[PDB]
Amino acid sequence: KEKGKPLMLNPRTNKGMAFTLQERQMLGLQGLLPPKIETQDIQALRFHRNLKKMTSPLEKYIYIMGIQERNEKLFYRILQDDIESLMPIVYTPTVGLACSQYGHIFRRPKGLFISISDRGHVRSIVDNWPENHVKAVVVTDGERILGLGDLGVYGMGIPVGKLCLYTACAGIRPDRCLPVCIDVGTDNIALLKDPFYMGLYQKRDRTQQYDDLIDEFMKAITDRYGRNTLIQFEDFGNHNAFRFLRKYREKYCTFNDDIQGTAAVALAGLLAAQKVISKPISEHKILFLGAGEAALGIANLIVMSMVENGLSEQEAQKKIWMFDKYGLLVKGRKAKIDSYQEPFTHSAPESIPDTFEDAVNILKPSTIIGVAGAGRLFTPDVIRAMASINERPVIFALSNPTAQAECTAEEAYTLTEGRCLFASGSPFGPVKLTDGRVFTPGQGNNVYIFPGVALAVILCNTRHISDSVFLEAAKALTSQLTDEELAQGRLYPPLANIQEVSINIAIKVTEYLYANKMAFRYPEPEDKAKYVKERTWRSEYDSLLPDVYEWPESSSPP
Amino acid sequence: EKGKPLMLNPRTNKGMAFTLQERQMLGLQGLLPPKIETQDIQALRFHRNLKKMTSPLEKYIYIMGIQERNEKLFYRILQDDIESLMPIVYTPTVGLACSQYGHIFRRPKGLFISISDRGHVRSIVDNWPENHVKAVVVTDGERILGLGDLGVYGMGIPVGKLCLYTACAGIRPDRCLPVCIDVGTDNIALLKDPFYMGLYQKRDRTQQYDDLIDEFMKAITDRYGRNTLIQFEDFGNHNAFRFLRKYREKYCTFNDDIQGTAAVALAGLLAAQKVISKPISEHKILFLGAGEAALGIANLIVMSMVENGLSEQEAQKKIWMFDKYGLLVKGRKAKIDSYQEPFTHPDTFEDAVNILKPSTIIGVAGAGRLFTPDVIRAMASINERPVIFALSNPTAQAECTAEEAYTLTEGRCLFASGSPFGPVRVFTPGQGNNVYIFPGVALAVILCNTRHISDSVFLEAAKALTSQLTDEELAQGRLYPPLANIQEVSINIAIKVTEYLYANKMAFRYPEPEDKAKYVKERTWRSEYDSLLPDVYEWPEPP
Amino acid sequence: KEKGKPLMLNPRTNKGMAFTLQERQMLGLQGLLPPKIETQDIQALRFHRNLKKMTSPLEKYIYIMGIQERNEKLFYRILQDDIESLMPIVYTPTVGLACSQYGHIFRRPKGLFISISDRGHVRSIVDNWPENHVKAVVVTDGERILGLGDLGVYGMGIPVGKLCLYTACAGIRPDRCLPVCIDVGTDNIALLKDPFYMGLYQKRDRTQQYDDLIDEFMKAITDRYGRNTLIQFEDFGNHNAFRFLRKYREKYCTFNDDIQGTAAVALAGLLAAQKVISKPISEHKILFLGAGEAALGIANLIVMSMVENGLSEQEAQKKIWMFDKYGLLVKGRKAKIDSYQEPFTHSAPESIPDTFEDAVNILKPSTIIGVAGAGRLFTPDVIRAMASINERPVIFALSNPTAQAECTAEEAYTLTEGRCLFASGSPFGPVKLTDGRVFTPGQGNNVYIFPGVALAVILCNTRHISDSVFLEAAKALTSQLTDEELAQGRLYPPLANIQEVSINIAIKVTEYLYANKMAFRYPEPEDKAKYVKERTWRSEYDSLLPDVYEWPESPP
Ligand SMILES: NC(=O)c1ccc[n+]([C@@H]2O[C@H](COP(=O)([O-])OP(=O)(O)OC[C@H]3O[C@@H](n4cnc5c(N)ncnc54)[C@H](O)[C@@H]3O)[C@@H](O)[C@H]2O)c1
Ligand SMILES: NC(=O)c1ccc[n+]([C@@H]2O[C@H](COP(=O)([O-])OP(=O)(O)OC[C@H]3O[C@@H](n4cnc5c(N)ncnc54)[C@H](O)[C@@H]3O)[C@@H](O)[C@H]2O)c1
Ligand SMILES: NC(=O)c1ccc[n+]([C@@H]2O[C@H](COP(=O)([O-])OP(=O)(O)OC[C@H]3O[C@@H](n4cnc5c(N)ncnc54)[C@H](O)[C@@H]3O)[C@@H](O)[C@H]2O)c1
Ligand SMILES: NC(=O)c1ccc[n+]([C@@H]2O[C@H](COP(=O)([O-])OP(=O)(O)OC[C@H]3O[C@@H](n4cnc5c(N)ncnc54)[C@H](O)[C@@H]3O)[C@@H](O)[C@H]2O)c1
Ligand SMILES: NC(=O)c1ccc[n+]([C@@H]2O[C@H](COP(=O)([O-])OP(=O)(O)OC[C@H]3O[C@@H](n4cnc5c(N)ncnc54)[C@H](O)[C@@H]3O)[C@@H](O)[C@H]2O)c1
Ligand SMILES: NC(=O)c1ccc[n+]([C@@H]2O[C@H](COP(=O)([O-])OP(=O)(O)OC[C@H]3O[C@@H](n4cnc5c(N)ncnc54)[C@H](O)[C@@H]3O)[C@@H](O)[C@H]2O)c1
Ligand SMILES: [Cl-]
Ligand SMILES: [Cl-]
Ligand SMILES: [Cl-]
Ligand SMILES: [Mg+2]
Ligand SMILES: [Mg+2]
């Protein structure tokens, strides 16, 4: 119906002003573009110049996402050019604001919307998706959008943004990516009264119908695209996130980045710290502020790391303590202890702490991990206590956004006199102490892990993702940190290098999957690096010029 | 492009206004969020998102983005807020957009025909995907109103112009064709700009230029028909007049900068005459300027005078012009071309006013506040009701302000401007906007299958514009109908021009309608969504 | 979505092996065709060779129509190459046999099917037709397929075949042609019991629903395509055909070829005969065998011609007699005479004849016209009587099919010793007499009239078609007979020349329409011949080669 030449109308093939003169003439585009032939380089520079003239992150978001619908290769190029700056525009924290502020005007689909009203008919919706070879699905129900809570269908930006990073960071083919928003209602009263809300006007269905709908989705996706289709859950509520991971992980190819990706990036930072503090693992003691999704994810992966290094499971668990909103998790406390928290709930020490500071002084941890999301609870006295107890205290302030962090880099470095090994969830710039020393703290961003893991799983035709895959990814991340970087105080490789980092993780994870009988792509490649690098999708333009050539044309017909 | 055509095609796409049944039957279920909206709701969302934006440029970018997604929604939004949005989608915002942002292409915006394509223009015209073009707007970017030579960075102008063809007069958008002709630019900044989107050469001013324009006119009419309306916009003055003269009897063509300007200015003068009722033979017009606008307006004034019973010669004798080189008089120092000769019969303009004693002064100089307090007072001295038109744009280049005009004449002046002014005993001054004329004229010409456009058409359009003023409006000193009513005004102008065309044997659409009002109103394009629901029904109830 | 290159898959644009090497490479067809580049000339010769190895007319039909669905321009080239021989294959009498024998396997739509079950929803069916600029519609309900009777939806082929002749003969653009079959049931008992019948299993609806459906169709077509859209009715039952022509001719742009085309082609033949027999019109006497729809249509057009040449209507009517299955139409006879027959019913002569031979001897006509559909009733005694009464007797045997014709050409020329001016509606070949003289009999084929009339009406944006248009067409046809042809007693131009003949008719009719204020296309062309010839559709392939060229030979 859309009248015009398909190759310029389709964002997947469209090159815009980068179509060559001969391409334009042969493909019937001559006159439909201005009389200037550009390269992708020039198009990209025009974009970057224009973006600088816009004020709010939201204006930027609207501009850059517009390009995804016009010229796909230009879009990914622009993103890759300025990846560190643009990742928080296209994804968290900007993405979640955009729908609520602006909404959207549709032309091309953004992804699949599956509502509770569609129960019994989900396969029909999946069959409406235009692409036939989906390899990566990211799904949300919008209940727990990181930093915003329940946005209902206004969270469908989150899977879209996530998959932009799958492609930009690890070269997963954009045409094989499928964002999905599950709409079972919203408990956000403001949205239910909003005439411009784009979802169902009902509270969240929490009946068996909810579970049945998620089941129907999983079956429909894998019926169409295959049982090895990667399905990643994102921004579900805590109960749902954990139980769906448990329900599906041995039946489908699935992971939850909020739980498992978090665990791996955190662990990687701790393994980097161990490069400085090389004392035996038997002497480490980890104290968490918080006992929620992040704490449990991280702690369970620390235990697997410790078990690999000679400790028994039970002994490893005894080196991890947690302190939540109600205090120290000890056996027989008043506050509730769920089954996930039970292995880290130990017999009370002689003195029972009231405050986190008291807990530090009594337990004497080597490491504190802040995942409470409740502001500056790593107080000056907590930080000082850590530096008094340990020569090189490990302090991870992972809560986001910056306002919710347990402390700043500034506080950490200054109050420990440059001795702390520090990492954060939110971005902090260099810290100069008065004695001249400069510290560059790392950010434990989930983007270090999920692109590379996803690529490896897909390329290996892997069918289930064990926690041990995330342990391997954590080790592969840390293995890329140079000596010079560690000396600067970095516990993570630079974010600017995310493309190279992701590919290197994919190679290591691919080696692991083949070595542990988790791959099904045979023949098995002899050189895993070559295998991965040859399959990554490239943002450079292809030639679309028809092949025109003379035949020899040297006897005539009778 | 993989997906459902009806959704991907902006001409048919309804977005969230696709109904539940439409979505299911057409295979769209799940490709849109689970909310059924109306066009009304989509429009309200857009208006909110726009009111939460500040930069005219950023508004332009956002609005024009809608055109490439959902055509009906785009035009709905324009129509809803037409007075405020016309300055965004057209002059003066549109000229700024390209130079500052450029464009990222997906869908074609229109045709680009370069001097490098000489000999091959027909193949370019044949690449345009629409088969039934009725309205072409063409520029070479040489004289963008307010900005000068922007070369290819002025394709935005035809685009925005044709948006107003549709929004104001209901000309079908699929039958509109914007055209930019690129023969180079003399803008040195552009020639050194790596982001410039045109040919890196000075303007070709050889015979090759004339030949390319000829080739263009032939190619367009070869494909689409000899009656295809071709409107010239933002050419340099020499080229504008000479091309109008060259093509007007050979093709269906007009130049809005010359003829539209003339008509809208005349309409204002006619509205003033209704209030003043000064005997036409006692009128004397003094122009500040003797360029394109002046010659255009003067020629139409003469035609108006002649139809009322003056001879051409005596009508011309009532018009004087005063340019940058002083008064235009026979045997002066400065150059007097043959276009100026009819109006060539004091060292400052103030002196000119005092020695000639005009009833009307028309400011088309583009050179700032040359209607000084002195000039105004001297007009108010000579005349009971002075006519002062300060047409130069933008606001800062105007000959005087509205407040200045009324204050210094004790509210006795009949005043109009090219640039906008708020109410100033309250006087509500009118803005002589070209949008009053071109949409209605273009619609009438198209619906009538007219083949050539006489100057009398623009005279008729001027009278039809003035006739829509109410007595109340005239008593407030308003010389132009409210811009908010541009749709109604444009249709009314179209009806009057349609009647004129049939009566003077310039229409070729037969049979001829008995009721021209109905004829025009039934043919205007509508931005309301249509039903796309397949027709499903049971049959009545086999060896 | 049919995967591949649209230009190749679409029969309208497809050139097959005539795609040039450069076209194939640039359009992404290289390797999808054999490595040989042919011209349309070679493709046509291959077809013609293959056709000769087909035996039955049915087999030839299936083969040639297959090409329509593959390569439209090749199809029309082929039809034009061998037009005289192929018109009887693509149209009557072969076409009606095809569905009954074979049915059809559908891919592309052949045309629109509108059933009585679709009443109230006809517009949505018309909206499903993929072409947006239809100028020519041919519609049937399948009730009276010429020579075959009620075939129901198995008469789908007739509108298809007719429109093929619109294109091939007059250059009406094929994408602007729309065949339509109205299915309201069938009275054919054989079809009702046929598990392979492709229509509704019911008797024909003869209620108000039938009339309402036809009205809904007319409105739906003109609502979509415009009030000037030409709608031609074909192979309706006689009475339905007549009443619908009356109902719609002043409201829509419509004609019925069975009524009006027939009358025009018959008249043309008679006008040709009159050029040979200089006798003044007032001395002609015409006797019809039959007094039905064909007799009345022809007679009414003869009268219009006679009135134009100085006779009063009443006096013109007095020159025409009719003899039906009950005998001569005379005032006061026992057998009913209906109101339409009354103008040609006269006071009985001295003797009332019992047989047609007796009627010939008693009335002594100059001309007999057979339209009884009852077999060989122009007996040798009838023929000999005509040749003893008249030096040059005019004998038209127009009944169909051939078995029902009143006599053969052989019979007519031999028994009149070569003196008769003869025409039939059947394909009789040349007749050689013993003295060596060869006679080529005229065929009153409607294809002489309908293509040229259709083209003129469309090109002029004509809105209604008067009977006077068919009179003009008849004169325009006869005007093309050369002096040499007139001497040899040819009453029609050669069928081989049908393209040229049709265009010449269209030019004359266009002139007529403009001169009588029946055209609405303005500006009016000064030169009507040029106007028409520049607008006829051509079967020559166009170039589909993209335009590739160098530009004349940048800040960093
Ligand atoms: N940087 C990263 O890669 C990353 C990854 C995941 C989560 N996070 C951040 O971690 C934080 C927590 O996320 P989550 O999903 O685990 O949250 P959660 O709601 O699942 O867990 C919160 C926990 O904090 C405890 N808590 C709250 N207030 C407290 C207080 N004042 N003192 C002690 N404990 C308190 C609660 O009892 C609970 O155990 C958030 O800020 C989130 O952004 C960062
Ligand atoms: N299997 C097919 O449908 C198909 C179709 C055409 C060609 N081929 C060819 O067959 C060979 C093997 O086919 P294959 O597709 O299994 O390749 P592969 O086996 O090398 O790829 C391994 C897996 O990763 C997927 N994959 C590869 N690169 C990807 C990327 N960048 N983003 C997302 N997923 C990616 C593949 O779909 C597959 O599941 C290749 O030479 C290929 O060109 C296969
Ligand atoms: N009117 C349009 O919709 C249209 C569309 C595109 C281009 N044009 C151009 O306008 C000029 C005149 O075009 P026009 O269509 O008005 O032609 P026209 O006015 O010369 O033709 C008169 C009428 O005959 C029809 N017609 C012409 N040739 C025909 C054929 N071979 N078969 C069937 N119908 C036929 C036309 O559709 C029209 O109704 C040409 O230069 C043409 O390229 C017109
Ligand atoms: N409101 C409308 O509908 C409308 C339409 C067209 C043009 N305009 C305005 O009219 C103005 C003139 O446009 P144009 O195309 O006629 O310009 P132009 O270049 O064609 O003519 C300019 C004329 O002004 C004279 N001039 C310049 N500076 C002068 C000075 N200081 N003193 C005296 N004379 C001086 C020049 O000699 C020349 O005769 C512009 O500001 C434009 O915005 C308004
Ligand atoms: N001519 C065709 O190609 C065509 C195709 C399909 C249907 N029809 C029907 O045939 C009849 C004849 O219509 P017509 O189009 O010849 O004449 P019209 O009376 O409908 O319109 C007169 C002229 O104005 C044009 N026009 C009408 N509305 C317009 C608009 N809103 N914007 C721009 N141009 C506009 C037309 O193209 C035509 O040139 C109508 O009933 C129409 O629906 C015509
Ligand atoms: N396009 C056409 O429909 C067309 C064109 C030319 C010729 N024809 C043929 O002309 C013939 C008549 O068709 P029609 O529609 O006028 O038929 P009809 O049924 O309307 O009229 C037949 C007439 O012949 C008379 N008749 C029947 N048997 C007779 C007999 N034995 N002796 C004398 N008269 C007799 C009937 O009484 C009646 O007057 C058919 O063979 C038909 O195919 C048809
Ligand atoms: Cl571009
Ligand atoms: Cl929308
Ligand atoms: Cl072939
Ligand atoms: Mg495939
Ligand atoms: Mg069309």
Author numbering:
A (entry chain C): 22 to 575, 577 to 580
B (entry chain D): 23 to 367, 374 to 452, 458 to 574, 579 to 580
C (entry chain A): 22 to 574, 578 to 580
Reproduce text from the manuscript describing this model.
Malic enzyme 2 (ME2) is a mitochondrial enzyme that catalyzes the conversion of malate to pyruvate and has been proposed as a therapeutic target. A major function of the malic enzymes is to convert malate to pyruvate, serving as a metabolic shunt to regulate TCA cycle activity under fluctuating external stresses. Due to this flexible and comprehensive role, ME2 has increasingly become of interest in cancer as a potential therapeutic target.
We solved the structure of ME2/NAD+/NPD-389 and ME2/NAD+ (holoenzyme) at 2.45 Å and 1.89 Å, respectively. Both structures display the canonical malic enzyme tetrameric assembly, with NAD+ located within each active site cavity and buried within the tetramer interface. Interestingly, the active site magnesium cation appears only in conjugation with either malate or NPD-389 binding, but is otherwise absent in complexed ME2/NAD + structures, even in the presence of high MgCl2 (10 mM) concentrations.
